[PDB]
Design a protein around this ligand. Structure first.
Ligand code: CLA
Ligand code: CLA
Ligand code: CLA
Ligand code: CLA
Ligand code: CLA
Ligand code: CLA
Ligand SMILES: CC1=C[C@H](O)CC(C)(C)[C@H]1/C=C/C(C)=C/C=C/C(C)=C/C=C/C=C(C)/C=C/C=C(C)/C=C/C1=C(C)C[C@H](O)CC1(C)C
Ligand SMILES: CC1=C[C@H](O)CC(C)(C)[C@H]1/C=C/C(C)=C/C=C/C(C)=C/C=C/C=C(C)/C=C/C=C(C)/C=C/C1=C(C)C[C@H](O)CC1(C)C
Ligand SMILES: CC1=C[C@H](O)CC(C)(C)[C@H]1/C=C/C(C)=C/C=C/C(C)=C/C=C/C=C(C)/C=C/C=C(C)/C=C/C1=C(C)C[C@H](O)CC1(C)C
Ligand SMILES: CC1=C(/C=C/C(C)=C/C=C/C(C)=C\C=C\C=C(C)\C=C\C=C(C)\C=C\C2=C(C)C[C@H](O)CC2(C)C)C(C)(C)CCC1
Ligand SMILES: CC1=C(/C=C/C(C)=C/C=C/C(C)=C/C=C/C=C(C)/C=C/C=C(C)/C=C/C2=C(C)CCCC2(C)C)C(C)(C)CCC1
Ligand SMILES: CCCCCCCCCCCCO[C@@H]1O[C@H](CO)[C@@H](O[C@H]2O[C@H](CO)[C@@H](O)[C@H](O)[C@H]2O)[C@H](O)[C@H]1O
Lengths: 217, 165, 194, 63, 74, 73, 194
């Protein structure tokens, strides 16, 4: 049993067979927010969505940023790409955000109804015949059909491993984006610039010398 | 700007009040030496006054005809003219700390209510349980919303005593 | 039922299956009481018919070229005469209120005295398109759906006019000329932070 | 054998009682034809400092 | 604006809507509203003197309001 | 004269259908007409509010000539 | 079955063997339910027929010297008159949308009212090329295969136009002139790094 703190008392709500089936269960819940099974299920869905969104965003920030350091690309910084993209664009940010909110609200409402009732999106005669593929699998937050075209989820032997690689990576991405914000408010440069500046001199270029993270020193 | 007020960085009464405060402090300082404790204390007070006036003007506060800062409590005006730091953010900050305290106290009462002598725990505070609940109360809004959604936050009407009407 | 307003959600038990346009849409449970639901049905049908006529007229005036729906009563406020299809009407605002008040009072009084009749038939259906109640169920669904669509359309007419100042046809042409640059998110009225 | 079991918890239905809608432990039930045979003991005292009272068979419900 | 024409038309219109349109609704509401004098009339619909006075009063108020608004020239 | 209303009918026919107000105003006509304290309380509440209204409107919109100049008045 | 899309793979059990163009290609399991498979089958045949008509029209209009498929409706953007085979047409864009809408609505309504019929026959086959059901299965396979090829061709038309700017005939001549120097890898948008 892997634990987030060797020797600490793992909470009872995270030791049940239902909670142990979740990917990345390390018994980490000091505030006890997952004591309620319904709340735990809802938070599991929230964590999965956060993991996938953070992975996509951090990838979209790191890969183009790393390619910009070399001569492969010329993508601006993540904190300035919005203005540059909206300058030579066909629509203002408000109209684009409205269209985005409508398109995202439709799929988010369908996902919400599936969370409230699993497999309820497969109601016949409701989505032009595509409702048959809108039914998720036996595990909430892991649907098939149009999603997962390669069919890598059909093999159970690697399934338990695959989920472990999705949550963990996602958690790392969730921290990465957080760092991307903090560094932006502490150095004023991009993440690749901060990485290069730290690699040039780690004993003097870190958060202990930025003058913000340690105001008492 | 809002309500016919002017920014404190441009108000003449604001600068006049700053000059008046510095003038009375300097007048009091003129009677002491140059390297004594009252002189250093008065100089520190003067520097604090200058820093306070510069910080209030830098914050973008609105001053009235009296030269004193005025707060904006309307969320629309505060969010539209950059005044959310006056009454909005402190509102949510107080709500978080107040709900924190209330949730921790409620959890302690519910925890000690199932013991042999709850009144004894009410007069003699169980420090380990109180400390554990105080640390676990950081997620009070999420826990409170979950308790409200499950129906365990309130008590049924049949279990609460009432007067004979 | 006509369908499901929320795919996968259970339909309310107070909504009968034979009711036309029954999509199970009642989140606030307004039609829970059987007496209230009975009045709501005729109220919705009457509203749909009035909105259908109103939207058709508002679109017809602008399509033919006699201004929009908002500028139509502008003749009675500052020295003008009513013109129907380009023909001068010899009636002032004082005579219009009396005629309309008496006519609408008589018609609506008879309708109210009938006792909440939704589908009268007979004289109101000279062509006899709903003589048999078997096929009338499908035709009533079309009427209620077009009525709801027309109600939404009239609300949109009022909102778009109050936000921009142009007629429905003029707003449609402007949107066709610039879709991304001319919508509710770009008028500076609907969303204040955009 | 009439009345609630000794040691069980009951809810007081007397409107003018201090412990109305409150749970109390059953101490003893009189076997005669007295008006209030059930004896109920409560954890919280009333305004007079009393913790026990007598109630009728229909004034207490097993809750 | 002819005051006589406006007043006469408003009074006649209100009496007509009170005798041929809202008489049944008023009678149903007056009976369900539950010393007195029975104002029996020979009118086949039961439209008595009290109903005449009430509808004539409403018609006169409407006619004078219309005349007043038209007199304001706006 | 037959025409008019009966306050008991209006009170009895004013109950919400969902039962949010319970029986509504059924029996309220008798408890008001047969109780002089209810009528006195309603009258005093309305008169007190009207007296406050008089004070506010009289200082803000003076109705009598040369009243605003008389500060003591 | 018509074949195997992936050699060595097993065909899905939900795809009938007598279905025309059944290569066992369904990795997403979209046609798992029988009700969805019927609608998708009719939709695929209709899409193939429309794509065949569209690709044939685009190829003919660019081969006859009357512009490409993208510049066809440009006359109603800057002022002009549509020309078919070099003959002027006096119908403006407003009259075209109404007539096309009415005709398409009537034809599609009549087609959909039959209950999703894919092979009506009779009036649609005056030559009787599919009178016997023995040879019907072979010709249906040719129809679905040509339709799939036409759908792929139309997608290629749109993608190559959005990538280069020239028409399908002009792109074919350029590729025939310089195959290594003109392809999807040299447009500048398909491959970003190169
Ligand atoms: C949810 C994640 C996310 C979000 C919110 C964004 C947001 C943004 N990206 Mg980004 N991106 C992401 C993920 C993301 N990206 C990932 C995972 C990659 C691969 C590493 C990239 C690579 C990338 C590049 C190279 C560039 C951007 C750019 C941009 C900005 C312009 C918007 C745009 O591209 O027009 C809208 C885009 C579309 C509507 C999609 C067009 C289809 C693309 C071109 C083909 C990809 C196919 C795929 C199925 C979709 C915008 C702020 C551009 C920029 O910086 O602006 C100056 C830019 O140069 N992104
Ligand atoms: C506690 C009571 C309270 C009171 C008395 C007010 C009073 C006011 N609010 Mg407000 N507001 C409140 C709570 C309150 N608010 C809360 C809890 C929120 C958070 C949801 C908001 C968020 C809010 C916004 C975003 C805005 C206001 C605005 C306003 C002002 C005019 C609008 C109005 O009267 O309608 C009541 C307010 C609402 C129903 C909120 C929606 C705003 C409505 C739709 C009006 C906005 C249209 C436009 C901006 C009006 C101004 C036109 C022009 C002068 C620019 C007004 C003085 C508006 C303003 O003047 O901006 C500076 C403004 O846009 N409020
Ligand atoms: C567990 C602590 C607790 C909690 C959760 C509440 C909660 C509540 N009180 Mg209450 N109250 C408390 C303690 C508490 N009170 C104490 C100790 C007193 C005696 C001074 C009162 C006297 C009181 C009155 C007179 C009223 C309320 C009212 C209310 C309600 C309105 C919100 C409010 O803040 O009013 C204001 C509450 C206060 C001003 C007193 C708060 C005292 C502190 C901040 C609480 C800390 C308690 C404890 C020391 C901390 C736990 C320690 C533990 C971990 C060991 C609300 C549900 C109102 C009501 O009736 O509801 C509509 C009301 O009229 N309270
Ligand atoms: C019959 C429905 C209908 C239709 C076809 C239109 C069409 C149009 N509206 Mg409009 N509108 C509607 C309802 C409708 N509206 C309603 C109910 C309201 C009140 C909230 C408004 C308020 C409104 C404003 C303030 C403005 C427009 C404007 C416009 C034009 C630009 C698009 C836009 O930004 O609108 C946005 C419309 C909405 C955000 C609400 C639409 C209501 C629903 C979603 C549509 C009805 C169902 C629809 C037919 C199918 C929906 C399925 C889909 C969600 C998948 C456009 C031609 C703008 C204009 O004048 O052009 C420059 C403009 O400023 N509308
Ligand atoms: C929209 C057109 C369309 C439709 C409705 C169908 C429908 C069908 N096909 Mg078919 N197919 C098509 C196009 C289409 N096909 C094309 C263009 C090709 C050539 C590449 C093929 C080649 C093909 C083969 C080899 C086979 C089928 C088969 C089938 C049947 C199996 C059920 C199924 O797989 O789910 C139904 C399919 C759909 C509902 C289509 C979903 C549409 C998705 C979203 C398209 C995604 C592509 C993407 C958007 C591309 C655009 C790029 C973007 C950036 C713009 C089914 C009835 C199998 C069969 O048994 O034949 C009878 C089979 O053997 N198809
Ligand atoms: C019926 C199948 C078919 C055929 C015969 C062609 C044929 C051709 N295509 Mg094409 N293409 C197709 C499908 C097809 N395509 C589809 C389905 C797509 C969408 C992914 C594309 C997208 C596409 C682009 C973006 C381009 C071409 C181009 C071309 C021309 C050069 C070859 C090339 O580099 O493209 C390779 C085609 C595939 C790898 C497929 C050539 C005559 C290029 C051109 O216009 O010439 C300069 C060009 O840039 N095609
Ligand atoms: C568990 C627990 C429990 C216990 O009991 C207690 C405690 C301790 C409290 C805990 C913990 C918690 C935590 C840590 C949390 C965190 C989270 C996060 C961070 C998230 C993020 C998350 C994040 C996210 C999603 C993100 C995303 C991102 C994105 C999209 C991006 C985008 C973009 C891009 C691309 C580019 C451009 O240019 C810009 C932009 C537009 C910007
Ligand atoms: C169902 C439900 C239930 C749940 O539970 C809750 C909720 C959600 C609340 C809900 C919903 C609701 C809604 C949506 C509503 C809406 C309505 C409408 C819109 C109406 C209109 C309605 C509308 C209408 C009638 C309209 C009509 C119109 C008209 C007549 C017009 C007229 C006219 C014209 C011709 C033109 C000229 O120039 C002028 C005039 C003279 C002016
Ligand atoms: C099967 C499946 C299932 C599994 O499971 C999964 C997956 C993979 C998803 C799948 C696949 C899918 C796909 C491939 C799809 C595609 C489709 C298409 C391409 C269509 C088109 C389609 C296409 C089409 C119709 C087209 C059409 C066309 C047209 C009409 C044209 C017209 C025209 C012309 C003449 C020319 C002129 O100048 C202009 C116009 C007037 C414009
Ligand atoms: C979870 C919690 C507690 C429970 C608290 C409970 C049960 C609260 C219940 C509240 C209920 C039933 C209704 C509340 C209604 C609130 C209303 C109507 C207030 C609306 C706010 C308005 C109108 C505007 C506020 C403002 C905004 C947002 C920003 C600025 O403040 C300025 C201003 C005034 C405009 C327990 C158990 C004591 C434990 C501990 C914390
Ligand atoms: C028998 C008969 C008949 C009938 C006749 C007649 C002719 C009747 C009538 C009647 C009438 C002819 C009535 C009238 C009336 C009136 C009234 C009843 C009134 C009043 C009043 C008022 C109330 C007013 C008030 C005021 C003032 C004083 C001032 C200003 C303001 C106002 C206006 C408010 C007929 C032929 C049909 C048929 C046969 C039989
Ligand atoms: C924007 C301007 C245009 C909008 C104008 C709005 C005017 C509205 C006037 C309302 C007039 C009330 O009119 C009156 O309504 C009642 C109550 O429904 C009807 O009453 C009818 O229905 C009710 C119950 O639904 C029955 O109890 C009654 O026996 C029957 O007559 C009357 O027959 C009608 O005379």
């Amino acid at each position: 049993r892997q634990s987030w703190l060797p020797g600490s008392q793992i909470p009872a709500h995270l030791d049940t067979p239902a909670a142990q089936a979740l990917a990345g269960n390390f018994g980490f819940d000091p505030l006890g927010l997952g004591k309620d099974p319904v709340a735990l299920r809802w938070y599991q869905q929230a964590e999965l969505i956060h993991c996938r969104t953070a992975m996509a965003g951090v990838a979209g920030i790191l890969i183009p940023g790393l390619l910009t350091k070399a001569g492969a690309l010329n993508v601006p910084e993540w904190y300035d790409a919005g203005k540059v993209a909206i300058e030579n664009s066909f629509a203002p940010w408000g109209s684009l955000l409205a269209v985005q909110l409508f398109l995202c609200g439709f799929v988010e409402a369908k996902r919400w109804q599936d969370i409230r009732k699993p497999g309820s999106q497969g109601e016949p005669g409701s989505f032009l015949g595509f409702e048959a593929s809108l039914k998720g699998t036996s595990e909430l937050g892991y649907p098939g059909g149009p999603f997962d075209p390669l069919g890598l989820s059909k093999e159970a032997d690697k399934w338990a491993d695959w989920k472990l690689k999705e949550v963990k990576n996602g958690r790392l991405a969730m921290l990465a984006f957080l760092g991307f914000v903090a560094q932006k408010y502490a150095t004023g440069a991009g993440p690749v610039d901060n990485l290069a500046a730290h690699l040039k001199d780690p004993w003097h270029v870190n958060y202990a010398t930025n003058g913000v993270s340690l105001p008492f020193l | 700007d809002i309500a016919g007020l002017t920014p404190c960085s441009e108000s003449k009464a604001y600068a006049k009040l700053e000059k008046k405060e510095l003038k009375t402090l300097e007048k009091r300082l003129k009677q002491y030496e140059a390297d004594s404790a009252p002189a250093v204390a008065l100089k520190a007070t003067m520097e604090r006054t200058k820093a306070r006036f510069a910080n209030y003007a830098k914050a973008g506060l609105l001053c009235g005809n009296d030269g004193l800062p005025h707060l904006i409590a309307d969320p629309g005006l505060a969010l539209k003219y950059g005044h959310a730091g006056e009454v909005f953010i402190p509102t949510f900050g107080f709500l978080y700390v107040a709900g924190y305290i209330g949730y921790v106290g409620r959890q302690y009462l519910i925890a000690v209510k199932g013991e042999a002598k709850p009144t004894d725990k009410e007069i003699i505070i169980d420090v380990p349980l109180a400390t554990k609940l105080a640390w676990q109360g950081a997620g009070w809004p999420l826990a409170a919303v979950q308790e409200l959604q499950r129906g365990t936050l309130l008590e049924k009407e049949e279990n609460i005593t009432v007067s004979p009407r | 039922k006509a369908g499901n307003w929320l795919p996968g959600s259970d339909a309310p038990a107070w909504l009968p299956d034979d009711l036309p346009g029954n999509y199970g849409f009642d989140p606030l449970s307004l039609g829970k009481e059987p007496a209230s639901l009975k009045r709501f049905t005729e109220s919705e049908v009457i509203h749909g018919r009035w909105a259908m006529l109103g939207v058709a007229g508002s679109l017809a005036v602008e399509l033919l070229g006699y201004g929009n729906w908002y500028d139509a009563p502008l003749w009675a406020v500052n020295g003008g005469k009513a013109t129907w299809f380009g023909i001068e009407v010899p009636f002032d605002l004082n005579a219009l209120l009396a005629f309309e008040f008496v006519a609408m009072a008589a018609a609506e009084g008879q309708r109210g005295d009938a006792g909440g009749v939704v589908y009268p038939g007979g004289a109101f259906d000279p062509l006899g398109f709903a003589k048999d109640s078997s096929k009338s169920g499908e035709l009533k669904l079309k009427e209620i759906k077009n009525g709801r669509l027309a109600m939404v359309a009239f609300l949109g007419f009022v909102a778009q006019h109050a936000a921009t100042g142009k007629g429905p046809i003029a707003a449609l042409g402007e949107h066709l000329a610039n879709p991304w640059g001319a919508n509710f998110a770009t008028n500076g009225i609907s969303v204040p932070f955009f | 054998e009439v009345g609630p079991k000794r040691g069980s918890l009951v809810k007081i239905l007397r409107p003018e009682s201090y412990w109305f809608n409150q749970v109390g432990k059953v101490v003893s039930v009189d076997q005669s034809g007295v008006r209030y045979p059930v004896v109920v003991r409560f954890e919280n005292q009333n305004y007079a400092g009393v913790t026990t009272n007598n109630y009728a068979l229909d004034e207490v419900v097993a809750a | 604006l002819d005051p006589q024409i406006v007043i006469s038309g408003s009074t006649a219109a209100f009496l007509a809507i009170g005798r041929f349109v809202f008489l049944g609704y008023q009678r149903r509401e007056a009976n369900f509203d539950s010393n007195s004098t029975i104002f029996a009339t020979n009118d086949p619909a039961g439209f008595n003197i009290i109903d005449v006075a009430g509808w004539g009063a409403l018609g006169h108020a409407v006619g004078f309001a219309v005349l007043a608004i038209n007199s304001l020239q706006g | 004269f037959g025409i008019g209303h009966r306050m008991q009918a209006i009170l009895e026919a004013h109950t919400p259908p969902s039962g949010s107000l319970g029986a509504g105003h059924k029996g309220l006509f008798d408890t008001v007409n047969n109780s002089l304290h209810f009528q006195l309380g309603l009258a005093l509440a309305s008169v007190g509010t009207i007296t406050s209204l008089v004070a506010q409107h009289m200082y803000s919109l003076p109705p009598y000539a040369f009243q605003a100049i008389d500060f003591t008045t």
